[PDB]
Amino acid sequence: EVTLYDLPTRKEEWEKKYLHPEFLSHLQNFKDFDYTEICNDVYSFPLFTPAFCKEVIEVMDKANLWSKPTQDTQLYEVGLDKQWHYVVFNYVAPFVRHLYNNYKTKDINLAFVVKYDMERLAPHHDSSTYTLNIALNEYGKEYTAGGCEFIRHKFIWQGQKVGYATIHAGKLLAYHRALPITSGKRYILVSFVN
Amino acid sequence: EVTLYDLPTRKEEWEKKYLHPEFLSHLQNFKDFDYTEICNDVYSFPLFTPAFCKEVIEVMDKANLWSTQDTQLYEVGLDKQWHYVVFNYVAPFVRHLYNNYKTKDINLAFVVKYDMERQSELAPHHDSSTYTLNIALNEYGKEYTAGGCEFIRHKFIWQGQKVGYATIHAGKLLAYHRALPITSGKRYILVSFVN
Ligand SMILES: [Fe+2]
Ligand SMILES: [Fe+2]
């Protein structure tokens, strides 16, 4: 049975179990891929399956390597940096070339899972060319409130579906802040890409 | 008597001669600064005087270090004057335009010369910068015709920029652009890639 770590050694089984079928079937034709521009130059799109999000959370909860600041754990702390590098350069980068006029992805700065809970958010620019934000658990069923305010766009984005990703410019044009949750737990996967 | 190189040794005289009066008079109050958003998140604004642009072209034409046909500012001893300009004058305006974004460092600063025998391969591209400054150094229609810039993502053609006016836009991701060919004369621009 394929696991999160079997990429790209078991690439075919990995894509079927972990990549969202709408994203996987549009790898070579993103023009008919159903993504949404939630505000100017900011896009929401299905990327990962619920099984991916569930197992990522399980790895992070089991490791208990959270920072003692925003509660997070780096992907490389659980041995998933090489798998994520493959995801970015082979799956995310072609979609970035489609969304942002053939922009070529250079390198990965950071990749981590953030856990918002009750026991544990200023406006800022990201240290990235573009930032990925994947919702790992379900709004309403597992947490309330939360989301992200794009300050410049005057647009608040909340209630992202499980496995859907939000992509936005890191610097200059996408000033933003995370908004707190009011109950439950909210897990997200964040990556800063140059 | 003050020259381009006398910054910041003769700062007051340098600002009066080389900084556009509209920009110089709004250094501490940018909300009333008459700049134009020509397309989404792309702004055109006056920055330099005709004397600045005239003297920069003279320095580049006399140096004849052209090798796009461009010359870097450090090749004529103007890089540190430009470093002062970006951090003391441009950086506060960038914070006003782009939600308090702090300027980190200057990647490149150079003057480009377009002419009939050297129009360059006007290919679409992103810039290796967070934001890019593009200052028009000579007069549209008088010293060259056509030319300009096309913002491909914005679907906006930008032509006929006035002398000493700057265009600022994102370098990566969100401002895919290309220069437009000239039909006569010579077109000089001052470009800086800033992180
Ligand atoms: Fe952020
Ligand atoms: Fe450019």
Residue numbers in the entry:
A (entry chain B): 683 to 750, 767 to 818, 822 to 895
B (entry chain A): 683 to 749, 768 to 895
Source paper text:
Although its sequence resembles invertebrate LHs, L230 has >35% homology to vertebrate LHs with similar predicted secondary structure and solvent-exposed regions. Our findings reveal features of the L230 active site and dimerization interface that are conserved in human LHs, show that L230 dimer assemblies are stabilized by Fe2+-binding, and demonstrate that L230 has telopeptidyl LH activity and promotes cancer metastasis. Collagen-like proteins and collagen-modifying enzymes have been detected in numerous pathogens, including mimivirus, and here we showed that mimiviral L230 has telopeptidyl LH activity, increases the formation of HLCCs, and promotes metastasis in an orthotopic lung tumor model.
Fe2+ is coordinated by an active site amino acid triad (His825, Asp827 and His877). Tyr814 and Arg887 are positioned to bind the 2-OG C-5 carboxyl (inset). An enzymatic activity assay employing bovine skin collagen substrate to measure L230-induced conversion of 2-OG to succinate showed that activity was extinguished by mutation of Fe2+- and 2-OG-binding residues but not non-conserved Ala879. The L230 LH domain formed a tail-to-tail homodimer (889 Å2 interface) through loops in the DSBH core. L230 dimerization forms hydrophobic contacts between a leucine (L873) and an aromatic pocket formed by three tyrosines (Y798, Y801, and Y831) on the opposite subunit (inset, c). With a buried surface area of 268 Å2, the L873 residues lock into the aromatic pockets on adjacent subunits. L873D mutation caused loss of L230 dimerization and enzymatic activity on collagen but retained wild-type activity on a synthetic collagen peptide, suggesting that the mutant protein’s integrity was intact and that dimerization increases binding of lengthy collagen chains, which leads to increased apparent activity. Surprisingly, dimerization was lost following mutation of the Fe2+-binding ligands or Fe2+ removal, and dimerization was reconstituted by adding back Fe2+, whereas mutation of the predicted 2-OG-binding ligand did not lead to loss of dimerization, suggesting that Fe2+-binding stabilizes the dimer.
